[PDB]
Design a protein around this ligand. Structure first.
Ligand code: FES
Ligand code: K
Ligand code: MG
Ligand code: MG
Ligand code: MG
Ligand code: MG
Ligand code: MG
Ligand code: MG
Ligand code: MG
Ligand code: MG
Lengths: 86, 97, 97, 137, 86, 111, 78, 22, 119, 50, 100
RNA sequence: UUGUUAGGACCUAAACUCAAUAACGAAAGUAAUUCUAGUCAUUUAUAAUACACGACAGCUAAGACCCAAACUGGGAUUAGAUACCCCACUAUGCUUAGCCAUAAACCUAAAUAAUUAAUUAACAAAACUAUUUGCCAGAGAACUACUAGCCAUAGCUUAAAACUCAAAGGAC
């Protein structure tokens, strides 16, 4: 009947989402700026920031690395998506 | 618009009635034969890249034409610019995809 | 007409619905050992249903039992009891180093 | 056969000692890290004051009083007074979330004190007092 | 106040690694949401303001989690070209 | 008040006709299943049944206008007792005035 | 769109729940392939033609018949 | 969606309230 | 109705604890109750320090009393128990067993389009 | 039938209810035998009782 | 002449039932570096990775064993009107089939 | 004054996490715990000159008072600063009685029962039929003047004309 999410559902749909089944040229292992690219690179930087902190302060990587307990300043992937800069 | 032709849904995968396919294929093959009989131009068109070489090889065997590459905007509506003054357009286009 | 035509029926292979780890179980305020499995060891804060993995109905049942146990003198508010630190881990959350 | 982050449970018996004292006996270093001044106090397990320091007492003033390096100096000063009184191991209860929250703990380590644990006691009301109104800028 | 001291929000230092313990305590408080709670309790957020923020953050989390699914889903097809030359 | 108020020793409507058949039941069991150890809601199910017998020709039917009117008279008298203690309860004051108006509407259709 | 469900599926669902998929691998390139499950359903049908009315009787008898044939049926609850 | 029509009413009511005060 | 008392008692020796449970259960009977069962849960450390009758308590004896009583007696019982000097904290609730574990067939999830664009 | 059974069950259960006559005796039996309502669960859903 | 309805009822794919966690035999028809394109008799092929053990054995025409998961990988996304498909199947390569 | 107190008092005020939930209620509104009372059947839509309600602010009397805070005072800034920032402290926010009856009281969606195809002004929230009531008829003047009713008295509801203009307004 009354949905609080309706107020902001349409605003966040252009800022945090794009339509169509298209993946960026950069996202492949191997131009004109687009808004979808900003979304496709913003989410990866957050996932890698969340996921690369689940390795430094966890035991999977190694025993010395686990002891290092390395917190991260920021994660930022290159627009070309050639490599990452953690 | 495809639901008329679907025999049913087998655990999520739509099945195509092969009886309607047989009737429709008979008409389509029959039409394609009279066009070829009358010496019309037939163009095979597809953008599926797995079958690009097969479809180009098929057209060459038939004696007809294939366009499996990127289709330029205006190829048919603006043919005279793209091809020349008196270019003859295809009389039939077969869309494998 | 045709003997081999498909027969209407409910899906024989329909997969069962997944249940929560507290489905069809009694959540009691006096069972502080079970309630402690859904709070934080350090702060004692109740976990959300995205961490606990419970359904809505059980998430509310655990929430009410924790608040009742805390307010009646059964469960500590600010931390998890050290006795229950060894109980199985059922929540998708990691805190160590 | 591993280290436990969880403090030795009070009232029980443990195998961990520091200079022949149990966890319940180690003196406590109370650090109040606010956004302007970082104060530090060390007390015995019977709640007797041993050392005290702060960015203000060290001599910093105004905006310098609330920097990381100002708290580090305050921690080193508190360590020196406590070390004289006979303190080698401290339990660090750090209240507050200001700039010298960590720096005060780093100064205490630089001053020759051995921190065995770090607690946090930042006040978190459970529903409490209305905070002051948002600043417009 | 009426609870026991040194059980809640307490971490133990391992091998005199006082920086590693402090980094662990912060991840615990950040994960339990105490850091965000203390940040927002410095000044008063009006009830209408609070509701607008929570509805926006919820919708941002939905569209972000959904965009992650779409990239992960469409990244399976990301591989060496099998039909090079056609 | 009203002529009839259910006694404290009366059984609830679920076991009203079941305990009499049972040959012998203890005093304690009779007290547990009486109206003394029940909520007020149970005491209202007994009041309604008594009125249906004394008024309706076919007490088995509860969907007749006469039965619906009896259902609203018990509620109205219940809401009135509620409002005598909770003088500033505005939700139940609305429940009382809306039930009175509902009864008047049904009495008009019955007439 | 009609969901395509034949009467054999009632039997097939039970076989997969009780024994899983046959350890022999499906070969979907052979147009006349007979799987372990399809042999179970063919025998289960034969017994039902005789007139057995109990599903439990038809399921345990069919298992015995295939055991005589030598097929390795593992009642894997896991 | 501008608020211009609301601003005209805003000024009318403000000026009217000051007239009543005088 | 059927009510479950949750009575935390002062930590005492068995002679005095038994006297406290006789005085308590007698009060329930004096309020028109029918006691059904008595359970002990053992003496333990309280989750926090409770102050009753000008004394701070860290340990108490946990007991349950199952009984029946009229709806009007619940308040009188809690009032009386709060005045007793050997009762750290009395709490009457409706008996849990009177409430029956519901039956569930699983979790059919809500779609995300319904969550955002909703009725 | 259901209500007759439910009434009969309560009559049998009422045999073991507490009364003034057996109060002191029932109090001592309770103190001797403590009860525990604590149990835990696993990721699978099994109940673990220590 | 057999009818289409009969052909579908007696089809190996109809006998397979649900394709989740089923075992099937496939054939490698295309290889791209260490990626194997395997036809298991369905509409869409699957793509697996060359196993470290006996890598050289997996050549074109080699029949293998698979554990199916989905016959087509598809999923509707928030705000979509149709399911997005990657035109691929999901299977886990188990190893070579014994010729015997 | 400050920091600590596993010291005492207080029960004022407000209810973290749960809540990534979307329940209850006519709306307003409502989420610390417990208990008591309690929501329910009119076929359905359709009501005012009647009745009962109605956030916040405000008024009346007696209390409360942790914190917040119009106003006010003090300090900064500025050409000025009757402001934004800093500090202090009131009315007030709380309780109990009564009044007041207003909100962007806005899902800017009247209610109800159908339909999804024989249907893109734009944007928003797909289109559209039927039934009943309410409401609208260029913009401003105008949440104004006068009238009547009201515990309202610098108030609310009801609500024009002269006169001016050739536009005002909505979406892209
Ligand atoms: S899924 Fe059944 S109660 Fe949670
Ligand atoms: K609105
Ligand atoms: Mg004007
Ligand atoms: Mg001033
Ligand atoms: Mg004041
Ligand atoms: Mg109005
Ligand atoms: Mg509102
Ligand atoms: Mg107005
Ligand atoms: Mg006016
Ligand atoms: Mg007037």
């Amino acid at each position: 009947s009354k949905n609080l999410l309706k107020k902001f559902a349409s605003k966040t749909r252009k800022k945090f989402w794009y339509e169509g089944p298209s993946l960026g040229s950069h996202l492949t292992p191997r131009k004109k700026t687009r808004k979808e690219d900003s979304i496709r690179l913003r989410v990866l930087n957050g996932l890698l920031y969340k996921s690369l902190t689940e390795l430094l302060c966890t035991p999977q990587v190694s025993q010395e690395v686990y002891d290092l307990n390395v917190e991260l300043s920021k994660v930022s992937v290159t627009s070309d998506f050639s490599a990452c800069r953690v | 618009f495809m639901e008329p032709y679907i025999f049913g849904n087998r655990l999520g995968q739509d099945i195509i009635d092969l009886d309607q396919t047989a009737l429709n294929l008979q008409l389509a093959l029959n039409f394609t034969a009279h066009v070829a009989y009358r010496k019309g131009i037939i163009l095979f068109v597809s953008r599926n890249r797995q079958f690009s070489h097969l479809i180009e090889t098929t057209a060459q065997a038939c004696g007809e034409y294939a366009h499996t590459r990127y289709f330029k905007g205006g190829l048919l509506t603006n043919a005279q610019l793209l091809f020349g003054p008196s270019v003859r357009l295809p009389d039939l286009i077969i869309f494998l995809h | 007409s045709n003997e081999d035509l498909p027969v209407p029926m409910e899906n024989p292979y329909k997969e069962p619905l997944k249940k929560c780890v507290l489905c069809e179980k009694r959540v009691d305020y006096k069972n502080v050992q079970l309630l402690s499995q859904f709070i934080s060891p350090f702060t004692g804060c109740i976990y959300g249903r995205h961490i606990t993995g419970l359904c809505g109905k059980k998430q509310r049942e655990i929430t009410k039992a924790i608040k009742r146990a805390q307010k009646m003198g059964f469960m500590p508010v600010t931390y998890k009891d050290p006795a229950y630190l060894k109980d199985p881990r059922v929540c998708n959350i990691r805190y160590r180093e | 056969s591993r280290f436990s982050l969880y403090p030795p449970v009070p009232g029980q018996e443990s195998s961990l000692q520091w200079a022949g004292m149990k966890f319940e006996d180690v003196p406590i270093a109370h650090i109040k890290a606010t956004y302007n001044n970082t104060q530090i106090q060390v007390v015995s397990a019977t709640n007797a004051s041993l050392a005290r320091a702060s960015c203000g007492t060290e001599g910093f003033r105004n905006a310098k009083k609330g920097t990381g390096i100002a708290a580090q100096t305050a921690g080193i000063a508190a360590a020196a007074k406590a070390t004289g009184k006979g303190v080698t191991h401290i339990r660090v209860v750090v209240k507050g979330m200001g700039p010298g929250r960590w720096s005060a703990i780093k100064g205490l380590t630089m001053g020759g004190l051995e921190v065995i644990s770090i607690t946090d006691n930042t006040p978190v009301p459970h529903x409490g007092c209305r905070p002051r109104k948002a600043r417009r800028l | 106040a009426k609870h026991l001291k040194f059980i809640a929000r307490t971490v133990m230092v391992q091998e005199g690694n006082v920086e590693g313990a402090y980094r662990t305590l912060n991840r615990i408080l950040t994960t339990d949401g105490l850091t965000e709670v203390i940040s927002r309790r410095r000044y008063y957020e009006k009830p209408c303001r609070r509701r607008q923020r929570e509805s926006y953050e919820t919708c941002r989390r939905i569209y972000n989690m959904e965009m992650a699914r779409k990239i992960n889903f469409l990244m399976r097809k990301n591989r060496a070209d099998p039909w090079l030359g056609c | 008040k009203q002529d009839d108020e259910p006694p404290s020793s009366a059984f609830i409507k679920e076991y009203k006709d079941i305990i009499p058949n049972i040959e012998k039941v203890d005093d304690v069991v009779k007290r547990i299943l009486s109206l003394e150890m029940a909520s007020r809601k149970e005491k209202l199910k007994i009041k309604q049944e008594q009125l249906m017998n004394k008024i309706v020709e076919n007490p088995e039917d509860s969907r007749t206008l006469e039965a619906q009117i009896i259902a609203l008279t018990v509620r109205i008298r219940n809401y009135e007792e509620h409002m005598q203690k909770h003088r500033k309860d505005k939700a139940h004051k609305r429940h009382l005035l809306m039930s009175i108006d509902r009864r008047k509407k049904l009495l008009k259709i019955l007439r | 769109i009609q969901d395509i469900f034949y009467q054999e599926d009632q039997i097939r669902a039970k076989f997969f729940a009780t024994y899983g998929s046959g350890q022999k691998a499906f070969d979907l390139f052979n147009p006349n392939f007979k799987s372990t499950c399809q042999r179970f359903v063919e025998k289960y049908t034969e017994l039902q033609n005789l007139g057995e009315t109990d599903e439990e009787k038809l399921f345990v008898e069919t298992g015995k018949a295939l055991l005589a044939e030598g097929i390795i049926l593992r009642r894997v609850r896991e | 969606k501008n608020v211009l029509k609301i601003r005209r009413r805003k000024m009318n009511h403000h000026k009217y309230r000051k007239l009543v005060k005088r | 109705p059927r009510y479950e008392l949750a009575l935390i008692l002062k930590a005492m020796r068995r002679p005095e604890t038994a006297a406290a449970l006789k005085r308590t259960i007698e009060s329930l009977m004096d309020r028109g109750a029918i006691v059904r069962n008595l359970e002990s849960l053992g003496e333990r450390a309280l989750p926090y320090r409770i102050s009753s009758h000008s004394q701070q308590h860290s340990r108490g004896g946990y007991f349950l009393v199952d009984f029946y009583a009229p709806t009007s007696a619940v308040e009188n019982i809690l009032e009386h128990l709060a005045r007793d000097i050997d009762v750290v904290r009395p709490n009457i609730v409706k008996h849990p067993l009177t409430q029956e574990v519901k039956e569930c067939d699983g979790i059919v999830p809500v779609p995300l389009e319904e969550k955002l664009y909703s009725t | 039938q259901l209500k007759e059974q439910e009434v009969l069950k309560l009559q049998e259960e009422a045999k073991n209810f507490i009364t003034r006559e057996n109060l002191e005796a029932r109090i001592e039996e309770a103190l001797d035998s403590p009860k525990s309502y604590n149990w835990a669960v696993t990721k699978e859903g099994q109940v673990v009782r220590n | 002449v057999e009818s289409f309805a009969s052909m579908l009822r007696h089809s190996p794919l109809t006998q397979l039932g649900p394709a989740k966690d089923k075992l099937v035999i496939g054939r490698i028809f295309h290889i791209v570096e260490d990626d194997l394109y395997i036809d298991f008799g369905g509409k869409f092929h699957c793509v697996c990775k060359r196993p470290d053990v006996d890598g050289e054995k997996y050549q074109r025409g080699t029949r293998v064993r698979l554990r199916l998961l989905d016959l087509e990988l598809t999923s509707r996304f928030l705000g979509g009107t149709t399911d997005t498909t990657i035109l691929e199947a999901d299977a886990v390569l188990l190893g070579l089939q014994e010729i015997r």
